[model samples]
Target: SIKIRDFGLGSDLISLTNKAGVTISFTNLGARIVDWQKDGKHLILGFDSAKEYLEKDAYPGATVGPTAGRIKDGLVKISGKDYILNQNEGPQTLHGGEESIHTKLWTYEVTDLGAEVQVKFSLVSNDGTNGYPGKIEMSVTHSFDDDNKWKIHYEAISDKDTVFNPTGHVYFNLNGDASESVENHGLRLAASRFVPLKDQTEIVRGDIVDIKNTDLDFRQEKQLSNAFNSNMEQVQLVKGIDHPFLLDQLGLDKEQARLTLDDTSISVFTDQPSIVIFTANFGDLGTLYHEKKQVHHGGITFACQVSPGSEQIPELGDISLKAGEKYQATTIYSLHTKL
Candidate 1:
């Protein structure tokens, strides 16, 4: 079943709920995934009301991009030209600056795909909307199936040479409660390396390093607390997991990551190059999240995408889109065990 509901303020929520009780709700503003529930139990952290969304800065299920992660010093050199972007986060640009896609309202269409439902949200950013070089058209299509398979397809095109990177920032808490810490959740990733970041600030530093015996390794499913609470310098610097894990490869056939808690788990498969994991390293925001106060490490996000700041650090990978090149990406979230 699919329905559009009036959300707080001017936003509208498009909800697609399968017969099995898995429902995914998206708000046109930012194309945010505001709710994901199974058997009426919430699976992701987000505000149920629109006022809180307006008053908070946490991306919380926002479709963040143009350049998903932090861009060092808000400067990118493409085709021998240096473009300066808005430094929304101090010296660096966090999620494409203050006016990125996450802050805008998008046009959308809801479609019934037989036994499934799909919602597509789209927006076009004029050239220089955060100092980015091209006028780009972006769209994110999310589809839900009766078996609880939530798939996302992101598409974009630019008129000029530009940095193109966008990602879905949905914080998951399989326990269905935002107040509970994610320390108890189990995490597994098919990744051999992680993008190292500068201590404290989370700025990209050096190059990709092997997870090795470090706490960054998550090849085996284990309590998230093990990695975040360990004495690992990288973990300590950010108060939790905040680095992007580089998957061994990219495709939808292989399960790239999974998060499990108690009786519920979500398997992740994507065609993106990396997954940025952030274990909600901070405390309460000014607004209430589903009537509960925010707790540090309360949720975790599986922000799968291409390498962040790839333009500056070519070793990470190239995310440049020149004229005629299309940015196509897909990510799937499955609740019916690891497929």
Candidate 2:
């Protein structure tokens, strides 16, 4: 079942419900997953309305891209030409710069696919928007099914050669309460390596390195509390988890990551080569999803996308899409209680 309700003056919130009684909601701004509830438990963190999302939200449940990770020096060189992007984070460009896709109003379409229901949001990134070349037609589809499985597909077609590392920045607080922290959550990642940072820099700033004996290793299920309490420089740098975990395989043949809390769990499956995990370092969640707005270490995210070196490193996973070429990526999050 699907429901579209008034979220604010110019925004509409769309809700989808499967036969299993799981319900989820989304808004056009950022095409975010505002609410995902089972019984009376809300599992995703988000603002109460689009007005608040526009006013204060920082990619709470938004789709993040033209690129995900911060590009060192805000520089993008393509085919020997250098494009200087708008710098939003020091000398680097963060979250694709000022166009702020997360706050953009995208066009949407809904469809019912029997076993699955979907709402596809589409947007056209301008040819030179924030110094990124080529007009790219992008669409992101958020689909939910009868078995408590929700999937997101990001697709794009550029008129000219361009780079993209698009990802959804959805946060999961599996305890089913937005006000609580994720300290009790357990995370398992299928990564033997990660995109390394040289100094106090974001991803793609350095080279890819092995996570073997490092503090970032999560080859097995590990409690996130250990990470929060870790004195490791990497963990302390971002104030929590923030690394692009390189997947062993680049397809959906296996589970890329998993997040569990108490009796509930979410198994993540993605076709992307990397899953960038981020724990909420932001001390406050301004929007008031619950009665309490003060939250620290609240949400955890898995942004599945390319390794994203683009023009920086040729050895890394190339995110370039040539003219007339289509780019598609899929990520699925299956929610369930112990069964």
Candidate 3:
């Protein structure tokens, strides 16, 4: 049970640790989890300060949602109106714009397991916010489990009519102090199908339908590096993954774990419906990493989330949140052993 308190000045971390032995610094401004360490080893490195992700140029691991992944054309009609949001990621509004709820801090409370922080972000466009109709209030909770598992839950409510899709975009490179690429690590996902993105140009829908031959299938368990040779067209999209997966939503009763990552040192488990397994394809920190950091050591990012069509997919259930409703989704990360 670690308790953390923030002074809001971004300089409050040192003081909180003095009082609680260990404290989590959470900003109400972006729901961002910044500066965390257990017995002195940083749990999440790139995020050292609340302000690290405030800049448009900085892509340190920040909370992403309101609607995380991609939205078609960044133009969706909600309640008979059209809303236009910040278009930062080329044609589509990425990560829900610069003003994304992830950029705002929230109220937090420490618990027996870890800490619980909540943030509320909204927008009213006669048309909608970022092309979404209905006023939306999204709540993202960052909790550190007793087992040292850091998890995030996304929930939202909207008035009028709108859609919601939120997810955490944290990057990991568990191999430790190395600049090596993550292709050698073993990755497994339960999804049979995945959303396809070709050349970062299109967002196509459909089940994996075929995991036997395409690089998209992880139904069995294999090293992410081996999949590179897969002949699937979608695999060629972002040069790797970067695609959304249609999950087995039917089994989500009590957060049935659906994803895992093993670098031979740690194993992470999650109950998330969709797992976006994207290797660190971009960075240049200058090491042997295939994808060098922009200026430092690079890392791999595996985003546990829902498929892109959270809004219109009737079979996947309701992704829409009315003003009084709640949109909640959880993702848990646990370490593993060779067994």
Question: Least lDDT summed over 10 consecutive residues: which range in candidate 3?
Answer: 11-20
lDDT of 2 by residue, 31-143 (tens): 77898998878888877877777766668788988998788888887877787987988988888987578878888999999888999999999898888887999999999
Q: How well does candidate 3 match the true structure in TM-score terms?
A: 0.74
- Give the lowest summed-lDDT range of ten residues in model 2: 285-294
- On lDDT, the stronger of 1 and 3 is 1
Better of 1 and 2 by TM-score: 1
What TM-score, over all chains together, does every model reach? 0.96, 0.94, 0.74
For candidate 2, list the clashing residue pairs, or say none: none
RMSD in Å for all candidates: 1.8, 1.8, 5.1
Q: Write the per-residue lDDT of candidate 3 for residues 1-339, one digit (tens) a residue.
A: 333444344522321242234444444455555544445543443444444445322344556766667665676555556656567667676777756666554444444422333223232223355556656655566654334445666666666666677666665654433355556656666567665553555454533344554665666677766766666676655556666655554343443232334423433445556666665554453432222233222355557666664434434444455667666776665543345
**Shift in Å, residue 75, candidate 3:** 1.3
Model 1 pairs whose backbones collide: none
User: For every model in order, what is the number of clashing pairs?
Assistant: 0, 0, 31
Candidate 3 residue-wise lDDT at 218: 65
List the candidate 2 regions with Cα displacement exceeding 4 Å.
201-205, 284-287
Off by over 4 Å in 1: 284-287, 337-339
What TM-score number comes out for model 1? Answer: 0.96
